[PDB]
Amino acid sequence: HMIALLAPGQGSQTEGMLSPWLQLPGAADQIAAWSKAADLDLARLGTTASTEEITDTAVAQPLIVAATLLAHQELARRCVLAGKDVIVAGHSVGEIAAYAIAGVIAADDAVALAATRGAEMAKACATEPTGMSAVLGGDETEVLSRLEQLDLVPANRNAAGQIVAAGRLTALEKLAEDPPAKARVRALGVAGAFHTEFMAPALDGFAAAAANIATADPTATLLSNRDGKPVTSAAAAMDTLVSQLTQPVRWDLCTATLREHTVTAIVEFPPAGTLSGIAKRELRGVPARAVKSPADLDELAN
Template identity: 55%
Template structure:
C-alpha cells in the first residue's frame, strides 16, 4: 500500500511554486485556484517573502494548491492513483479533494475561508505554537496542562506541538522537561485549540452547500487515525478539526496496520517525510518538493523503487 500524504501549515518556503509553474497547464490551474481561494497564489508562491507567506490567509491556500497540483501530476505520470490518502491539518482539504470527496476548486474555496477565519480568530489573543521534541508523552502532556497549554498536534516520533498563550509558551521554553527541546513555530496563533472555535462555525457555514462523494481510495482522518468511507462525514470531521488536536501519530499507526509499503509526501514536502523516518521505520518515503522529485515518487508508486 502506497500512501500519499499532504502536508500542513509551516511547510511553505519562499518561491517553492516556481518550478511547478513551468509544467504545462499549471499556470491555468493555479489561476482558477487563486480565484476560488481569493488569493494570488502565483505571486505569493513565486515572489513573496517568508513573512508574507507565513500569513495564515496566504499559507493555507498555497499549501493546498501545491499539494493538489503535485499529486495530480504524480498520478498523471504514474498512470494510477495512490492506494491511500491523508493530510496533516490543512492538508486534509487537499486529501479529500484528491480522494474525490469534493472538487479541487471547492477545496480551494474552503481553504480560503478556513485561512481567513483562523487568522481572524488568532487575532483575538496573543497565542502561538511550539514543538516539544523528545521526552515521555504523558509527562509532556501533563506539563502542558500545568501551564494551561493544549497538545495541539500529536505528530509521532517523539514530537508534540503545544499551543496557547505566548507567556505560557515562553515558560515552557525557559524550563523544558528533562530530555526535551522546545522549538517555537512560525505560525500566527494557537491552531487546533479552543481559541479557534469562531473559525469552526465560519467553515461549517461554508461547507453547507458543497456537494460530496464517497472517497475513491482509503482516506484517513486526523481526528483519531481511522479511515472515513463517507464523504459528508469526512468534510464534517475537517470542520471540527480546526479546534481539535491533530492525531498524526494515530494516522501513522493506522498506515502500519493497513500494511503501508511506501509514503509519498507531496509539495511543499519535507515535514511529514521527516516524521515518517521516526514513526514509520523501514518504510520508504519520498518527498516531492519539486517536479524533479516526481521520477522517484512514480517509481515508488508503481513498485519500481
C-alpha cells in the same frame, strides 16, 4: 501493495515554492482558476512573494494546498498511479489537499476552502494572544502532564517525543521558562493556537463554506487527524474536517494506522516537509519519496 500519499501542513511553505510547478502544462491555468476560487493571487504568492508574506496563515494555507494539488493534478495527468492502491492522509491544513486527492472534494473547491480556513483562523488569532511551541524530547508523561498544568493543549501529537503545545502565549512562556527535563521547547512562527478551542471563532465561517461545497464519498482510504481512523463517507469526512479546526492533530495515530495496512511506499507531496521522516519511523523498511519537483513524478511509477 499500497502507496501512502501524505499531504503537508503549515510550516513547510517557502518563497518560489510554485515556480517549478507553474512550468507544467495547465499549471498556470489551474493556479488562475484557483486564484479566483480563493480570491487570492496565488501565482505571485507562490513565486515572487516573500517567505514572510506567505507565512501569513491566511495565505500559506491555500498556497500549500495549491502546491500539493498541482503535483497531484500532474500525477493524475500522467496516470503514473492509475491502477495502484493508495491510502491518503494529510497533516492539519494538509487534510484539505488529502481530501481532494482522495476524491472527496474538487481541487478548486479545496483551495478556496483552504483560503477560507486561513482567513477565518487569522481572524481567530486576533481574539486571544495565542501561539504554538514544539516540544521535543523529555519524558512523555511529564511533558504532557506539564502541558495540562499550564492550560496548554497538545495540539499536535506527531510521534513519540514530538509534540506541539498550544495555548495563550502567556502559558507558552511559562513552558519555555521551566521546561520538563530533557525537553526542548521552541516557539513556532505562527499567529495563534491552531487546533485548539482558541480557533473556535473560525468555526462558523469554515463550517458554512464546507457545507456549501459539492462532495463525494472518498475514492480511496482517507485517514483523519482526529483519530488516525478512516472517514468513509463524504458527510463524515467533511464534518470531521470542520471539527478538526479546534481539535488536536493526532498524526501519531494516522501513522499507526498506516502501519496496520501494507504500506509498501511513502510519497509526500510538496511543499515536502517532515511527514516522510515521521512516517519512516513507524513504517521501517518502507521507501519514501519527497516530491519537490516535477522531475520526481516519474519514479513514483517504478
